[PDB]
């Protein structure tokens, strides 16, 4: 599914990401925008053999298990295929575990390069939440 910006912001708010572990809501929207262009089905094969899945491009080497990745650790104890759904529930569940590590949102490289240090609340402005 291709979420609109406002649509995604209200869903992520309903899924409890506004102020989760010190991160304001716009961080999550901006991250989804640069990680997957708001596409729940996005996939990206990495040179190391892992794949990045879904709206938050969650990696198969550490977080979910797609059965094809070498040192898979499955930290979110979930099959990768559950992250490729139009329902964001499982993506948000795993993302909350990912950000609870001391690396916080720095695990998402597009967030790191395009969002950190920017006015991230701009991503939720002009939206009915």
């Amino acid at each position, epitope marked *: 599914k291709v979420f609109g910006r406002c649509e995604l912001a209200a869903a992520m708010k309903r899924h409890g990401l506004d102020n989760y572990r010190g991160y304001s809501l716009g961080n999550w929207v901006c991250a989804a925008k640069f990680e997957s262009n708001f596409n729940t089905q996005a996939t990206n094969r990495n040179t190391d053999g892992s794949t990045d899945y879904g709206i938050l491009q969650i990696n198969s080497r*550490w977080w979910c298990n797609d059965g094809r990745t070498p040192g898979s*650790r499955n930290l979110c104890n979930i099959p990768c295929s559950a992250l490729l759904s139009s329902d964001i529930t499982a993506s948000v569940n795993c993302a909350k575990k990912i950000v609870s590590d*001391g690396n916080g949102m720095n695990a998402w490289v597009a967030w790191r390069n395009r969002c950190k240090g920017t006015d991230v609340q701009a991503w939720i402005r002009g939206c009915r939440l």
Partner: antibody
Amino acid sequence: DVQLQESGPSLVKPSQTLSLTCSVTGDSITSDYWSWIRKFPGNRLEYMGYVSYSGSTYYNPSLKSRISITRDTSKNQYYLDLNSVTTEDTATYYCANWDGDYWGQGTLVTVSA
Amino acid sequence: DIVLTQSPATLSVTPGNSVSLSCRASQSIGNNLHWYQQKSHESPRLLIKYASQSISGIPSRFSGSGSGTDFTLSINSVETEDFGMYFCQQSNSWPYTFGGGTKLEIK
């Protein structure tokens, strides 16, 4: 499947260091985040801290920095050290994964001279 | 810290009746609230995650609802194995905290 088991002393004296070990069976400790929770005598639960996959640690500020959590990847165990205990540290300690699905059985530690 | 207040502190009930436990947060925590059961001489058991996400292996009579600051755990026709303590827990902010507990007791 995964099993967790607490061990260490059940009786300690005031001001010493309490060390507990959590033994994990069924999967590696590198595959999750791991925590320590304790229950006081009147059913009061306190989340103590957790160690995440990168080795970073989060500790409850109610413990004033007397706690250390560490893990041993070759033994498949992780640990709790609590310095300068007092009688207020008398409690049932449990180890558990972060998700909260696996818990150990609990070990009652009493602090007394 | 986020303070979590649970009510009633005690609930006496006859098996086959339905109950609702309440848990209120001092600050808005979204859906970041989990519910545990603790029976005598047993480690806590996770019943509900993220306010209403049901968990595999636990009776369907338990359901949770709520968001923000007000959350409820409901038990449709309580059974004798349900008697014990119920605690809510927020994971929105660090340090994680627990509510004071509801005791569920046979009438």
